[PDB]
Amino acid sequence: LRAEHREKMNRMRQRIAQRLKEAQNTCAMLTTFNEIDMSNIQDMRARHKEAFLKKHNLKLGFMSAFVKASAFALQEQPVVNAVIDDTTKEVVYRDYIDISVAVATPRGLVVPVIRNVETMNYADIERTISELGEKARKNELAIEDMDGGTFTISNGGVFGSLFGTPIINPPQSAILGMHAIVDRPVAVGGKVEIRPMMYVALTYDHRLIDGREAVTFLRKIKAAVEDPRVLLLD
Amino acid sequence: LRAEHREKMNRMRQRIAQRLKEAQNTCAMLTTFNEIDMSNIQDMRARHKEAFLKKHNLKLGFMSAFVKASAFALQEQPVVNAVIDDTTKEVVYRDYIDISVAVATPRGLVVPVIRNVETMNYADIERTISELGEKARKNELAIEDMDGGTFTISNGGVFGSLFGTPIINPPQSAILGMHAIVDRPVAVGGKVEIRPMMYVALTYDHRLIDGREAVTFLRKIKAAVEDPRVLLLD
Amino acid sequence: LRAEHREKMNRMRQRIAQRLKEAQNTCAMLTTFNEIDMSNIQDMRARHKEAFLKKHNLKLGFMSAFVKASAFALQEQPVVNAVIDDTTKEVVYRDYIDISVAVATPRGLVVPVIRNVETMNYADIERTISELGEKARKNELAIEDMDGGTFTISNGGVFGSLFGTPIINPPQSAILGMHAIVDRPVAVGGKVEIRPMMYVALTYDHRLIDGREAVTFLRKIKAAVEDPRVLLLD
């Protein structure tokens, strides 16, 4: 039996598909990959998760380690923070860092913005994600705090993808895509151990960001997650 | 010696290159990857290949395991089966499953269609591929059975590519790309074994399919090839 | 404090971003990957690097092994050497091989051309890269020897990227992207050894090059780097 039926799409879905194709026809997107060893983050979460809950009443997750390491890399290379506006053919630098965090709730995808990430620590980031996660869950999430982001983390790794290519939020110039954590054999010190590792991806605008600047950017995020004490040093 | 000569391209190759660029300018294509362990398929082919040839006069291959697992995943998530027609800005659902199989013969690529995959088993799929493989080999393959497919398998793995990005057949919304089988060290149960594994890819339309629905789709194909008894269960 | 300031981009950067978007809107780019074992190249550099420096006054690097293996693969499949000109809708074959080498100096990226690679050896290629590397370093590099290339090597592996997708130099049809060398566990002979391996990528025009011809091309480059004695044989 061969049955097909035409259901229509509303005017809201019209604009979402319209903005999506404008993001590809504007900027020349490329993608680069790397690989992060997640051993120093898990034992940080293994021994300090109990004193964190008693003192702050929050959960200690992986997400706050990637947001704080992203604000560290952006303030070192400001060209990734930049945006090309094709109205006056201008290059708009910024001096503030607002990282948008895609948190997929039951309803669907929402992309709220964490404001002024430069001065925070892990305790401040965890407050911001938790209470704003409750806002969008019961649908009280405003429009005015969903725009103006300068960089975007995309957790598509809570479902188990190995690696993949993300899509740029069109008022920005780059996006980081984190993925699932698997145990794979690793050659460390000339021996074959098993360590939990993650593939990461970075989709960047090649009109603005150089091919070597995107590699150095993603290599700097790796150093601040394989060893989070670099945030206190250089 | 610097010699170059202009040979022309015919009007048939004109349209093939024309349809190819229309597939990129219409839909916003992204790609996601995963990894399948092919151990339960090979020992199925190791002990039952002799009773299969005596009783059916056919060869037992890898291809029929991917076609039957693809019809299983499509009937669970019908949104991958859908197509956006931009004539009336409509979303066309379908209730039938027709998987197109790219079988590269000596002449070149051909993409015939297997009709009504929902009711078949491995024995029915193997008859359909084998006799239709003989039709396109001696060039009696009609035009009327090359169109109307809803999903596409692309075996580019008979040449030995590791992984790569396929291209969407433009009346469809997704495509699966299987690749070569290599023996790689695998961390299973806390120990380092060697098991034959395959990388797979899924190129999807981001106008229609969500970013989390493409990950769940490819994760469901993996469960029906790492353990083919799920086709009898849920 | 929220400060942003508009700095302009000059008319040279206007055209670079203009040519970049024309390369995507012309040709349908896809990407395929593979993996090369770099053991036979390093012990060639381990024992012959001293007699090479005494006799030629040059350094023995990895780059000359990829340029000579690329001219070997291009003269076997001339369709990768071809270019589609959309002025008269023509397919322009060539009989000469000019490989462009992107050598990122302190100033930035430059892409000079090595002319007539068919007759050279490793000693001739190393002379051409070394003295022309000194020209672009002190900025005496002419314009007339930066155009007319037919194939492009892109070393983005001196910074440590795992793998990624390159961009086609628009008068060409393909580009090879080499990457960083890491020690990873390898299943060889049924045992788990540790060997230095590299991921490589090939971005090709799907209007002209078939999907199976790009896989066979990159598989042929692998055979001439895993065993460089094939250059004397077939």
XYZ file of C-alpha atoms in Angstrom:
702
model
C 0.000 0.000 0.000
C 1.448 3.345 -1.151
C 0.051 6.228 0.895
C 1.496 9.721 1.230
C -0.090 12.820 2.719
C 0.914 16.475 2.585
C 1.083 18.171 5.983
C 2.099 21.821 5.870
C 4.832 23.667 7.747
C 4.013 26.861 9.610
C 5.452 30.330 9.082
C 7.843 29.943 12.012
C 9.493 26.921 10.391
C 9.629 28.976 7.179
C 12.037 31.465 8.744
C 14.182 28.850 10.534
C 14.894 27.106 7.238
C 15.433 30.544 5.691
C 18.042 31.662 8.243
C 19.775 28.292 7.941
C 20.493 28.638 4.227
C 21.656 32.238 4.699
C 24.337 30.984 7.090
C 25.815 28.782 4.363
C 25.560 31.323 1.542
C 27.304 34.050 3.571
C 30.415 32.504 5.121
C 32.854 29.876 3.839
C 32.688 27.202 6.518
C 35.429 24.638 7.105
C 35.906 22.141 9.933
C 38.902 20.914 11.930
C 39.105 18.122 14.517
C 41.250 17.117 17.506
C 41.038 14.811 20.516
C 40.907 15.500 24.252
C 41.873 13.123 27.081
C 39.245 13.488 29.818
C 41.116 11.871 32.717
C 41.957 14.951 34.794
C 38.365 16.175 34.640
C 36.778 12.955 35.876
C 38.929 12.562 38.986
C 38.289 16.224 39.727
C 34.628 15.241 39.639
C 35.338 12.046 41.561
C 36.661 13.565 44.795
C 35.210 17.081 44.850
C 31.598 16.328 43.874
C 30.538 15.819 47.493
C 31.999 19.005 48.956
C 30.614 20.901 45.956
C 27.039 19.762 46.607
C 27.185 20.480 50.335
C 28.603 23.973 49.893
C 26.818 25.197 46.742
C 23.793 22.854 46.246
C 24.739 22.238 42.614
C 25.908 19.358 40.448
C 29.460 19.220 39.096
C 29.399 18.492 35.366
C 31.584 18.459 32.280
C 29.981 21.553 30.725
C 31.547 24.164 33.017
C 35.053 22.957 32.129
C 34.458 23.642 28.436
C 32.885 27.066 28.955
C 35.732 28.337 31.135
C 38.375 26.949 28.770
C 36.604 28.619 25.841
C 36.743 32.074 27.430
C 40.443 31.494 28.044
C 41.194 30.794 24.387
C 39.066 33.653 23.040
C 40.770 36.350 25.099
C 44.146 35.264 23.736
C 43.187 35.323 20.043
C 40.646 38.139 19.522
C 40.252 37.422 15.791
C 37.941 34.483 16.539
C 35.828 36.897 18.580
C 35.440 39.181 15.529
C 32.487 39.357 13.090
C 32.431 40.524 9.464
C 29.411 42.738 8.769
C 28.811 42.870 5.014
C 26.677 46.015 5.304
C 29.645 48.392 5.337
C 32.194 45.580 4.681
C 33.498 46.005 8.223
C 35.368 43.858 10.767
C 33.707 44.253 14.168
C 35.988 43.396 17.069
C 34.526 42.866 20.527
C 35.996 43.130 24.010
C 33.349 41.079 25.843
C 32.819 37.318 25.747
C 29.280 35.895 25.674
C 29.213 32.128 25.134
C 25.920 30.661 23.943
C 25.121 27.204 25.310
C 22.765 24.910 23.398
C 20.898 22.934 26.072
C 18.507 20.439 24.452
C 15.500 20.115 26.756
C 12.475 17.856 26.149
C 10.701 20.580 24.160
C 13.589 20.987 21.702
C 16.735 23.032 21.170
C 17.211 26.376 22.920
C 20.328 28.544 22.818
C 20.544 30.962 25.782
C 23.550 33.179 26.411
C 25.926 33.289 29.377
C 26.989 36.907 29.832
C 30.510 38.150 30.709
C 32.362 34.858 31.099
C 35.763 36.526 31.681
C 35.395 37.037 35.441
C 33.660 33.806 36.452
C 34.837 30.517 37.928
C 33.313 27.041 37.863
C 30.916 27.981 40.668
C 29.502 30.995 38.826
C 29.012 29.143 35.522
C 27.202 26.291 37.268
C 24.722 28.690 38.862
C 24.004 30.343 35.522
C 23.343 27.107 33.628
C 21.233 25.478 36.350
C 18.679 28.208 37.047
C 18.383 29.201 33.395
C 17.950 25.536 32.539
C 14.869 25.560 34.759
C 13.501 28.660 33.013
C 13.478 27.209 29.499
C 12.165 23.890 30.828
C 8.870 25.381 32.031
C 8.852 27.908 29.120
C 9.489 31.282 30.761
C 12.620 31.911 28.715
C 12.668 35.429 27.296
C 13.694 36.520 23.811
C 15.997 39.350 24.918
C 18.546 36.943 26.427
C 18.895 34.668 23.378
C 20.861 36.984 21.082
C 24.235 38.680 20.994
C 26.391 35.617 21.584
C 29.948 35.586 20.280
C 30.778 31.858 20.499
C 28.751 28.677 20.830
C 29.189 25.324 22.546
C 27.072 22.495 21.104
C 26.580 19.431 23.292
C 25.429 16.805 20.843
C 27.307 14.276 22.926
C 24.519 13.318 25.322
C 23.224 10.974 22.623
C 26.413 9.191 21.600
C 27.711 10.569 18.327
C 31.352 9.831 17.606
C 32.149 13.058 15.742
C 30.410 15.321 13.257
C 30.151 18.750 11.682
C 28.171 21.540 13.396
C 26.557 24.635 11.853
C 27.450 28.253 12.631
C 24.974 30.438 14.484
C 24.914 33.211 11.842
C 25.806 36.308 13.931
C 29.025 34.528 15.025
C 32.240 33.340 13.422
C 32.996 30.008 15.124
C 31.339 27.116 16.970
C 32.722 24.289 19.132
C 31.116 20.861 19.011
C 31.730 18.416 21.843
C 30.832 14.739 21.544
C 30.525 11.434 23.399
C 33.132 10.012 25.767
C 34.348 6.508 24.917
C 37.124 4.313 26.272
C 39.678 3.678 23.534
C 43.206 2.256 23.622
C 45.821 5.008 23.827
C 49.583 4.905 23.262
C 50.958 6.800 26.270
C 54.629 6.583 27.234
C 55.226 3.785 24.751
C 52.562 1.570 26.338
C 48.955 0.851 25.408
C 46.550 2.062 28.097
C 42.787 2.625 28.014
C 41.657 6.192 28.663
C 38.345 8.047 28.149
C 38.739 10.387 25.190
C 36.490 12.815 23.311
C 36.566 14.054 19.722
C 35.920 17.769 19.304
C 35.190 19.864 16.230
C 35.508 23.538 15.328
C 33.592 25.049 12.417
C 35.077 28.390 11.439
C 34.655 31.157 8.868
C 37.530 31.022 6.405
C 36.855 34.564 5.164
C 38.062 35.911 8.516
C 39.937 33.224 10.445
C 43.143 31.825 8.958
C 43.681 28.091 8.510
C 46.499 28.055 11.047
C 44.642 30.209 13.575
C 41.802 27.710 13.862
C 44.252 24.897 14.604
C 46.028 26.925 17.297
C 42.661 27.872 18.816
C 41.429 24.295 19.211
C 44.853 23.206 20.455
C 44.559 25.787 23.239
C 41.157 24.496 24.371
C 42.719 21.032 24.611
C 45.504 22.231 26.921
C 43.007 23.751 29.363
C 40.974 20.537 29.611
C 43.823 18.005 29.667
C 45.324 20.115 32.476
C 42.989 22.708 34.039
C 45.785 24.343 36.067
C 46.861 26.344 33.000
C 43.954 28.710 33.755
C 45.943 29.878 36.798
C 49.186 30.135 34.795
C 49.688 31.646 31.255
C 56.913 20.046 -22.921
C 53.668 21.860 -22.033
C 50.722 20.440 -23.967
C 47.034 20.830 -23.153
C 44.024 19.997 -25.293
C 40.354 20.878 -24.925
C 38.005 17.898 -25.156
C 34.333 18.757 -24.777
C 31.699 17.306 -22.462
C 28.387 16.131 -23.874
C 24.899 17.361 -23.035
C 24.266 14.424 -20.706
C 27.218 15.401 -18.513
C 25.861 18.965 -18.629
C 22.727 17.950 -16.734
C 24.513 15.673 -14.230
C 26.734 18.547 -13.126
C 23.638 20.765 -13.135
C 21.592 18.504 -10.839
C 24.599 18.120 -8.546
C 24.889 21.830 -7.779
C 21.122 22.106 -7.266
C 21.381 19.521 -4.488
C 23.797 21.748 -2.569
C 21.960 25.027 -3.166
C 18.619 23.603 -1.981
C 19.256 21.783 1.300
C 21.622 22.513 4.192
C 23.689 19.344 4.402
C 25.565 18.258 7.522
C 27.319 14.981 8.329
C 27.578 12.789 11.427
C 29.711 9.687 12.023
C 29.706 6.566 14.214
C 31.359 3.148 14.304
C 29.964 -0.371 13.940
C 31.517 -3.621 15.208
C 31.072 -6.236 12.471
C 31.720 -9.397 14.499
C 28.186 -10.798 14.734
C 27.663 -10.411 10.992
C 30.794 -12.285 9.942
C 30.172 -15.402 12.029
C 26.605 -15.383 10.749
C 28.207 -15.512 7.314
C 30.776 -18.042 8.501
C 28.429 -20.893 9.440
C 25.283 -20.236 7.408
C 26.834 -19.449 4.010
C 26.780 -23.100 2.941
C 23.160 -23.876 3.787
C 22.179 -20.558 2.193
C 23.767 -21.442 -1.153
C 22.297 -24.945 -1.250
C 18.774 -23.794 -0.438
C 18.540 -20.468 -2.305
C 21.425 -20.471 -4.868
C 22.585 -17.038 -3.716
C 25.594 -15.500 -2.003
C 25.381 -14.190 1.561
C 26.845 -10.687 1.744
C 27.118 -7.664 4.000
C 24.728 -5.517 1.939
C 21.476 -7.222 2.961
C 22.209 -6.585 6.648
C 22.396 -2.833 6.063
C 19.265 -2.650 3.910
C 17.105 -4.512 6.427
C 18.460 -2.468 9.343
C 17.748 0.731 7.405
C 14.075 -0.118 6.900
C 13.865 -0.824 10.624
C 15.145 2.617 11.599
C 13.032 4.510 9.056
C 9.720 3.051 10.207
C 10.454 4.178 13.759
C 11.308 7.802 12.923
C 9.141 8.875 9.954
C 10.654 12.381 9.807
C 13.737 11.038 8.010
C 11.368 9.525 5.452
C 9.848 12.975 4.776
C 10.683 15.387 1.915
C 10.300 19.175 1.774
C 8.831 20.294 -1.557
C 9.565 23.995 -2.052
C 6.846 24.344 -4.701
C 4.032 24.809 -2.186
C 6.430 24.887 0.826
C 5.079 21.512 1.925
C 6.311 18.591 4.053
C 5.534 15.335 2.243
C 5.379 12.329 4.545
C 5.448 8.831 3.087
C 4.235 5.479 4.378
C 6.304 3.257 2.065
C 10.041 2.582 2.191
C 12.043 2.350 -1.047
C 15.795 2.109 -0.451
C 18.022 2.963 -3.406
C 21.218 0.916 -3.644
C 24.225 2.311 -5.511
C 25.915 -0.718 -7.095
C 29.064 0.351 -8.971
C 29.436 -1.984 -11.950
C 32.262 -1.862 -14.521
C 30.345 0.634 -16.671
C 29.946 3.134 -13.821
C 27.534 4.084 -11.056
C 23.875 3.056 -11.216
C 21.263 3.610 -8.514
C 18.298 1.203 -8.809
C 15.511 1.050 -6.249
C 14.393 -1.821 -4.021
C 10.629 -1.525 -3.609
C 8.642 -2.115 -0.382
C 11.413 -3.161 1.993
C 9.096 -3.376 5.038
C 7.910 -6.956 4.470
C 11.123 -8.610 3.282
C 13.792 -10.721 4.958
C 17.420 -11.372 4.055
C 16.366 -13.937 1.445
C 14.078 -11.525 -0.406
C 16.613 -8.671 -0.466
C 19.327 -10.968 -1.816
C 17.126 -12.049 -4.719
C 16.329 -8.445 -5.603
C 19.946 -7.253 -5.640
C 21.334 -10.259 -7.525
C 19.007 -10.395 -10.530
C 18.838 -6.619 -10.876
C 22.619 -6.531 -10.648
C 22.684 -8.710 -13.756
C 20.286 -6.375 -15.579
C 22.397 -3.231 -15.242
C 25.557 -5.214 -16.008
C 24.451 -6.100 -19.547
C 22.605 -2.736 -19.905
C 18.911 -3.652 -19.907
C 18.172 -1.508 -16.867
C 15.058 0.599 -17.377
C 14.531 4.237 -16.445
C 11.179 3.739 -14.696
C 12.751 1.781 -11.821
C 15.497 4.304 -10.991
C 13.385 7.031 -9.380
C 11.181 7.478 -6.345
C 13.638 6.284 -3.717
C 13.312 7.570 -0.167
C 16.716 6.598 1.282
C 20.069 5.617 -0.180
C 22.878 3.255 0.772
C 26.264 4.082 -0.783
C 28.863 1.312 -0.811
C 32.088 3.170 -1.418
C 33.779 0.623 0.799
C 34.705 -1.929 -1.859
C 37.734 0.231 -2.646
C 39.103 0.881 0.832
C 38.208 4.371 1.977
C 38.431 4.941 5.711
C 35.558 7.428 6.003
C 34.179 10.315 3.980
C 31.237 12.556 3.188
C 28.547 11.437 0.706
C 26.156 13.572 -1.364
C 22.356 13.552 -1.129
C 20.308 12.174 -4.001
C 18.178 15.326 -4.451
C 14.617 13.916 -4.168
C 15.551 12.494 -0.729
C 16.461 13.835 2.692
C 19.196 11.493 3.953
C 21.901 9.089 2.758
C 23.950 6.402 4.536
C 27.558 5.813 3.544
C 29.236 2.546 4.479
C 32.998 2.084 4.235
C 35.863 -0.406 4.440
C 36.303 -3.004 7.176
C 39.639 -2.880 9.000
C 40.999 -4.644 12.066
C 41.718 -2.083 14.777
C 42.457 -2.445 18.491
C 39.308 -2.074 20.588
C 38.865 -1.526 24.329
C 36.193 -4.078 25.263
C 35.569 -5.052 28.885
C 38.662 -3.189 30.031
C 40.941 -5.205 27.736
C 42.450 -4.456 24.337
C 41.160 -6.852 21.676
C 41.289 -6.670 17.877
C 37.917 -6.584 16.132
C 36.809 -5.715 12.570
C 35.082 -2.339 12.650
C 33.511 -0.015 10.079
C 33.027 3.752 10.055
C 29.643 4.916 8.797
C 28.370 8.351 7.815
C 24.955 9.984 7.528
C 24.418 13.133 5.475
C 21.136 14.778 6.396
C 19.060 17.857 5.587
C 19.187 20.254 8.520
C 16.140 22.187 7.287
C 13.955 19.185 8.140
C 15.830 16.756 10.385
C 16.921 17.939 13.828
C 20.516 17.620 15.011
C 19.550 15.140 17.712
C 17.287 13.097 15.436
C 20.133 12.295 13.057
C 22.268 11.006 15.928
C 19.462 8.789 17.246
C 18.828 7.482 13.719
C 22.412 6.360 13.107
C 22.614 4.934 16.624
C 19.616 2.734 15.805
C 21.225 1.349 12.641
C 24.245 0.414 14.765
C 22.138 -1.592 17.230
C 20.617 -3.683 14.432
C 24.017 -4.589 12.973
C 25.951 -5.148 16.211
C 23.089 -7.462 17.239
C 20.682 -8.474 14.445
C 18.211 -10.115 16.854
C 16.713 -6.699 17.669
C 14.786 -6.968 14.378
C 12.700 -9.700 16.039
C 12.292 -7.675 19.252
C 11.462 -3.898 19.600
C 32.271 46.791 30.367
C 30.909 46.275 26.833
C 33.181 47.868 24.236
C 33.284 47.134 20.512
C 35.041 49.048 17.758
C 34.759 48.851 13.982
C 38.087 48.462 12.187
C 37.823 48.250 8.412
C 39.217 45.677 5.995
C 41.211 46.806 2.981
C 40.465 46.220 -0.692
C 42.941 43.340 -0.883
C 41.043 41.403 1.787
C 37.867 42.235 -0.157
C 39.012 40.160 -3.128
C 40.395 37.254 -1.058
C 37.014 36.765 0.602
C 35.419 37.211 -2.826
C 37.493 34.495 -4.526
C 36.879 32.184 -1.570
C 33.098 32.189 -1.945
C 33.387 31.726 -5.717
C 35.276 28.481 -5.106
C 32.323 27.065 -3.169
C 29.602 28.307 -5.522
C 31.320 26.843 -8.605
C 32.305 23.264 -7.767
C 30.609 20.590 -5.653
C 33.262 19.750 -3.080
C 33.356 16.484 -1.144
C 36.046 15.036 1.120
C 37.493 11.558 1.655
C 39.992 10.355 4.269
C 42.563 7.576 4.731
C 45.551 6.801 6.942
C 49.259 6.438 6.185
C 51.867 4.542 8.232
C 55.015 6.690 8.328
C 57.542 4.066 9.445
C 59.462 3.535 6.198
C 59.932 7.276 5.734
C 61.402 7.938 9.172
C 64.097 5.258 9.029
C 64.957 6.501 5.553
C 65.492 9.845 7.260
C 67.244 8.180 10.187
C 70.214 6.671 8.337
C 70.537 8.781 5.188
C 70.189 12.275 6.687
C 73.932 12.581 7.293
C 75.143 11.580 3.835
C 72.435 13.809 2.349
C 73.681 16.912 4.170
C 77.334 16.291 3.328
C 76.676 15.713 -0.365
C 73.885 18.217 -1.108
C 73.898 20.737 1.813
C 70.156 20.310 2.330
C 67.804 18.959 4.975
C 65.864 15.734 4.430
C 62.194 16.273 5.265
C 58.780 14.679 4.944
C 57.540 17.121 2.286
C 59.546 15.761 -0.655
C 58.065 12.282 -0.158
C 54.533 13.619 -0.600
C 55.333 15.750 -3.646
C 57.001 12.898 -5.532
C 54.210 10.464 -4.640
C 51.638 13.007 -5.829
C 53.200 13.314 -9.285
C 53.169 9.523 -9.487
C 49.433 9.272 -8.848
C 48.487 12.137 -11.173
C 50.240 10.700 -14.220
C 48.313 7.453 -13.802
C 44.839 9.012 -13.557
C 44.777 12.127 -15.782
C 41.164 12.989 -14.890
C 42.280 14.489 -11.567
C 44.666 16.677 -13.560
C 41.740 18.032 -15.629
C 39.842 21.328 -15.130
C 36.286 22.232 -16.154
C 36.131 25.714 -17.688
C 32.535 26.954 -17.584
C 33.204 29.606 -20.238
C 32.742 27.227 -23.169
C 31.644 24.303 -20.914
C 34.913 22.536 -21.699
C 37.088 19.865 -20.051
C 40.725 20.973 -20.201
C 43.188 18.109 -19.910
C 46.841 18.826 -19.196
C 50.024 16.877 -19.856
C 52.269 18.699 -17.365
C 52.244 18.455 -13.573
C 52.768 21.587 -11.460
C 52.226 20.971 -7.744
C 51.607 24.048 -5.604
C 53.070 23.878 -2.099
C 51.576 26.002 0.680
C 54.518 26.945 2.914
C 53.317 29.014 5.889
C 56.099 31.458 6.749
C 56.005 34.014 9.592
C 54.365 36.616 7.344
C 51.452 34.332 6.432
C 50.403 31.807 3.808
C 52.064 31.739 0.387
C 51.443 29.194 -2.365
C 54.340 28.982 -4.863
C 54.460 26.432 -7.660
C 56.975 23.664 -8.338
C 57.264 23.304 -12.108
C 57.532 20.015 -14.065
C 57.581 17.489 -11.230
C 57.582 14.454 -13.570
C 61.353 14.278 -14.106
C 62.626 15.120 -10.621
C 63.859 13.062 -7.683
C 64.035 13.830 -3.970
C 67.215 15.860 -4.487
C 65.660 18.152 -7.096
C 62.479 18.802 -5.087
C 64.491 19.668 -1.979
C 66.499 22.282 -3.870
C 63.341 23.876 -5.245
C 61.569 24.170 -1.888
C 64.602 25.411 0.054
C 65.742 28.316 -2.120
C 62.200 29.420 -2.925
C 61.410 29.231 0.776
C 64.124 31.833 1.312
C 62.657 34.082 -1.393
C 59.190 34.399 0.135
C 60.705 34.760 3.611
C 62.461 38.040 2.785
C 59.611 39.066 0.401
C 61.139 38.865 -3.079
C 58.591 36.322 -4.270
C 57.206 37.235 -7.682
C 53.604 37.058 -8.855
C 54.318 35.230 -12.124
C 55.354 32.025 -10.329
C 52.276 31.736 -8.084
C 49.692 30.702 -10.683
C 49.038 27.812 -13.025
C 49.233 25.006 -10.482
C 47.337 21.790 -11.135
C 47.390 20.189 -7.661
C 48.045 21.436 -4.146
C 49.641 20.036 -1.004
C 48.565 21.741 2.237
C 50.788 21.218 5.272
C 48.556 22.204 8.148
C 50.272 19.524 10.181
C 53.104 21.611 11.614
C 50.652 22.834 14.250
C 49.088 19.567 15.377
C 45.650 19.150 13.862
C 44.313 15.610 13.866
C 42.357 15.817 10.602
C 40.221 18.377 8.812
C 38.732 19.594 5.555
C 40.777 21.786 3.176
C 39.551 24.236 0.520
C 40.187 23.985 -3.226
C 42.449 26.509 -4.917
C 39.872 27.580 -7.541
C 41.795 27.002 -10.814
C 42.313 23.350 -9.758
C 40.176 20.276 -9.200
C 41.703 18.578 -6.142
C 43.789 19.272 -3.030
C 45.666 16.994 -0.606
C 45.803 17.861 3.078
C 48.472 16.290 5.262
C 48.311 16.452 9.053
C 50.170 15.758 12.295
C 52.049 12.554 13.089
C 50.983 10.807 16.295
C 51.830 7.451 17.842
C 48.692 5.322 18.025
C 48.167 1.614 18.699
C 47.938 -0.378 15.469
C 46.737 -3.931 14.823
C 49.476 -5.375 12.600
C 49.797 -9.122 12.041
C 47.231 -9.853 14.731
C 49.238 -8.005 17.393
C 48.934 -4.517 18.856
C 52.004 -2.405 18.079
C 52.567 1.352 18.294
C 53.422 3.064 15.013
C 53.493 6.724 13.884
C 50.523 7.322 11.602
C 49.071 10.306 9.736
C 45.530 11.091 8.614
C 45.250 12.546 5.122
C 42.359 14.198 3.309
C 41.436 14.796 -0.325
C 38.906 17.444 -1.330
C 37.708 16.861 -4.873
C 35.263 18.269 -7.419
C 32.344 15.884 -7.798
C 31.258 17.471 -11.091
C 34.362 16.017 -12.754
C 35.926 13.334 -10.561
C 33.905 10.207 -9.798
C 33.349 8.999 -6.239
C 35.365 5.847 -6.850
C 38.187 7.651 -8.657
C 38.941 9.829 -5.642
C 39.236 6.766 -3.409
C 41.598 5.014 -5.832
C 43.676 8.198 -6.121
C 44.255 8.586 -2.382
C 44.889 4.854 -2.047
C 47.697 5.196 -4.596
C 49.386 8.021 -2.676
C 49.335 5.764 0.392
C 51.141 2.935 -1.415
C 53.983 5.244 -2.467
C 54.557 6.502 1.083
C 54.109 3.226 2.981
C 56.632 1.739 0.529
C 58.588 4.258 -1.581
C 60.117 1.556 -3.806
C 56.923 1.445 -5.894
C 58.179 4.604 -7.642
C 60.843 2.414 -9.279
C 58.317 -0.323 -10.129
C 54.752 0.100 -11.606
